[PDB]
Amino acid sequence: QQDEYTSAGNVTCWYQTGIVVPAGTPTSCSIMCFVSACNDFSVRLLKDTPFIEQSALLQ
Amino acid sequence: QQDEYTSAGNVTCWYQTGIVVPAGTPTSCSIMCFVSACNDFSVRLLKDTPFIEQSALLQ
Amino acid sequence: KSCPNPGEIRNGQIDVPGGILFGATISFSCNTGYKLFGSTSSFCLISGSSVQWSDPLPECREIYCPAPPQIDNGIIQGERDHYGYRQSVTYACNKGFTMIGEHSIYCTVNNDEGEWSGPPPECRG
Amino acid sequence: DRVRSITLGNSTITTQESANVVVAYGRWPEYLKDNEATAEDQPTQPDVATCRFYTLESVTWERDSPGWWWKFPDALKDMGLFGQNMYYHYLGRAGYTIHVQCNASKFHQGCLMVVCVPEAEMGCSQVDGTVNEHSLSEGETAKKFASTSTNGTNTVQSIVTNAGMGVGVGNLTIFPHQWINLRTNNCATIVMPYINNVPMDNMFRHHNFTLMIIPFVPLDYSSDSSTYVPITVTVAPMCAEYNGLRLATSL
Amino acid sequence: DRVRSITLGNSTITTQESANVVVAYGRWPEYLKDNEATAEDQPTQPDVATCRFYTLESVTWERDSPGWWWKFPDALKDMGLFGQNMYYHYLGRAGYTIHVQCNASKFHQGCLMVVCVPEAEMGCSQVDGTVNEHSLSEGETAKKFASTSTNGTNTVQSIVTNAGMGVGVGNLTIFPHQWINLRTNNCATIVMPYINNVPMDNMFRHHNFTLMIIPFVPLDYSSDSSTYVPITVTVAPMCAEYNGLRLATSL
Amino acid sequence: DRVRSITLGNSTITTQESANVVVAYGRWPEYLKDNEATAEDQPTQPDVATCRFYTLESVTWERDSPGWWWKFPDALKDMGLFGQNMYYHYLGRAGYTIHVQCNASKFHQGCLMVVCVPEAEMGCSQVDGTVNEHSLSEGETAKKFASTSTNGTNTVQSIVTNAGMGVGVGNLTIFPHQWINLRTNNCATIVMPYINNVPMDNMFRHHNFTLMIIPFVPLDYSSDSSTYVPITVTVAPMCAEYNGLRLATSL
């Protein structure tokens, strides 16, 4: 639950030369980004996850 | 300063099969030619070069 | 205080001999083959809520040689308008006529005005 | 064979259609040794803060575009902790690694020359005149050649065919160079040692070398290929010393 | 693997999309040895003046074009010092190297057969008739098959599907051949020894073999691909002897 | 490196732009050993009649097409002597080799995810409801995701972004998967062992796993590239046992 003490930074992406296509190919392409943890990652101090929640039993 | 005694020849270039391009590429291309001397070249009998010339001092 | 960036006159040039700070002047020129339609210089003056440039950027518009002088007893291979700088005009003679002189004329610019080369050829009977 | 990676400082460059790497005269950047040195005091050698890949803004290769030139240093003078040591110090020394990056498709065609010129002393437009400093270098904004002979006071005679130095623009192949032929490669790398006639030299006064990018064969494409083809230049110092510290210069 | 170079005499051929090299029957051209020879006198062996790459004029592969055939020798009879020794001498022997060169883009498609046929005795158009010599060979100008059955006296029955010899045009794969598939390669090479039933044989009388180029799959392209696709043929003798010198023939 | 061949039974698969082969969890299909087995009687192992490449009908990748899913087995239940043993036997065990084949040109672009999901229990459209069996599997006809939230009784909630299981459709990379990026490869292969919590299990009751093909980046092309791009799926059992024979089931 990061604050601005333990902030981590920000990543940004820019064209270096641009996209060049011949005639007869589309001009609008797409990128995609896959996140994973390196081989020195670790987590600690178990807590509950805020993403699941109910309002009565039988759920 | 070659004459027709020490002439050297002439080079010439011709299509062997031709240029073939798909659809959507330009048809007019360009070649370029780079000249260099082989590893057995030599020159002798220093002279002045005709390419530089002046008409008074301070030049 | 600094005026915004002058810019870039294509087919031309901007000369800034003293910076772009307040009260600094800049000059405009056009390359060989273009006429300068616009202002010649621009100063860094006070503009309302900033300092900006006295005059906007000018344009270097192509200098054109006039239509090539036709010749009697002759012909021009695909005659055209818009004969800019360094462009050529090729002549030919008609049946039974002999060609004399420069058989093609190339457009240059002199004193900032378009001008063809030497006279077109002649066709002798 | 065509893949390559260049890791300098905290910066990396990946490439997949590289031709080779010109090392200027077979010579790699190195530090000033003890017997070729002339200054007495101990030099600064920051080594990771300054010897990394600084990327200058990119230029648009148009169909009718003569060329471009940058001057190093004075291009990297506002780049991080190279452009700061370069301010606080009198004497500086460094080599570079220039990576020029221009990519197109397989339906485009063209050919750039990428050439580093040591001491590219240039010639004003009025033969009886003197250049400015602005007319030699805009920083990271490239100056542009011209397809015709230029006019105007104090501005370099930048017709392409003479390259602003009075020589033939095709003989520039004597300098360390590469080409970018949009049918084979899409990047040129030149590793440039410290070429100069004094061991260390000031960095604001002397434009140690000039990078010229000159399209010999121009762009072209057909029905709806991509109209916009940019060129990006990355420079990375190497073996960078400074000597003679005092208060910061100002211009 | 696809690059190749063939150096014969003072001539070289470079190629970058070659499939392989057919050596006719696993056999390379060689000189007539002493125990298989029949002529008494000493042969001429010029060796560099005659065993080089002679290039014949090129033909335009159109969208509807049946094929082409040349006859060797009598194609190289006006080519340099092969076509001169071949005049002054009664008996001649030689193998060849045939390089067929046809290049297209990646948006074109097609498929040629390149096939060398020994003793390609041909059949006139009127079944009860006799060919000319012109109807078998025009020199370096190729003769052309026809997409339908031909008529006219003395002219070979040159419908493609029979190939002018009365056989099936798809069985020609029994002869030394290659294909030019405009999606993979752009040149075919066949190395052809001296195949004949006598050690040496006259060169004006006997068309030792026939080179047929037959497009099975025709050309095609789209919006504005290049309309003109030419084919060029280069032949180079190898191990060429002659015997029996006298005054020059005439035709 | 990109060429590959897979020979199973009397069937072969050739490929020339394969990326690699995912072996599900580093694990290859194998037979049930003697100490992990629970059924007493001797199993059938047909081995060449059932462990071969069965090809399901192909689907048309359109410009706006959410995805597809198949359920194995119950897709190969009408395929030869796999779908017959599978009828006559109570218990069955087998791994598979899934080869997905989709080819386009160099002027097309796209990206499929090909992912095998064990126990892909799915969620009905009415939250307080129950799926059909038809709504989970049509046999060899694929079921289709939907670009919006679906309605209707008994039909799986098949909005793509949740993949019908209630999870995020981008996290499916935890399962054995590949991509088909129409710029690099044109086939994905996943070798899938028998993953289940009992040694052998019935084949009509339990959909052992689910194959989902989901285009993340959609099709696109320009002026007259080929509009029709199909996807074909081939599955081949491996190490297939059956146990518990009796009269044939019926549905």
UniProtKB/Swiss-Prot annotation, chain C:
PTM info: The Ser/Thr-rich domain is heavily O-glycosylated.
SS bond list: 3-44, 30-60, 65-107, 93-123
Domain of life: Eukaryota
Domain Sushi: 1-62, 63-125
UniProt tissue specificity: Expressed on the plasma membranes of all cell types that are in intimate contact with plasma complement proteins. It is also found on the surfaces of epithelial cells lining extracellular compartments, and variants of the molecule are present in body fluids and in extracellular matrix.
Effect of residue 80 to H: In GUTI(-) antigen
Family: Belongs to the receptors of complement activation (RCA) family.
Record text on subunit structure and interactions: Monomer (major form) and non-disulfide-linked, covalent homodimer (minor form). Interacts with ADGRE5. (Microbial infection) Interacts with coxsackievirus A21, coxsackieviruses B1, B3 and B5 capsid proteins.
The record's note on its domains: The first Sushi domain (SCR1) is not necessary for function. SCR2 and SCR4 provide the proper conformation for the active site on SCR3.
Function summary: This protein recognizes C4b and C3b fragments that condense with cell-surface hydroxyl or amino groups when nascent C4b and C3b are locally generated during C4 and c3 activation. Interaction of daf with cell-associated C4b and C3b polypeptides interferes with their ability to catalyze the conversion of C2 and factor B to enzymatically active C2a and Bb and thereby prevents the formation of C4b2a and C3bBb, the amplification convertases of the complement cascade.
Disease: Complement hyperactivation, angiopathic thrombosis, and protein-losing enteropathy: An autosomal recessive disease characterized by abdominal pain and diarrhea, primary intestinal lymphangiectasia, edema due to hypoproteinemia, malabsorption, and less frequently, bowel inflammation, recurrent infections, and angiopathic thromboembolic disease. Patients' T lymphocytes show increased complement activation causing surface deposition of complement and the generation of soluble C5a.
Name of this protein: Complement decay-accelerating factor
Range of the intact protein held here: 161 to 285 of 381
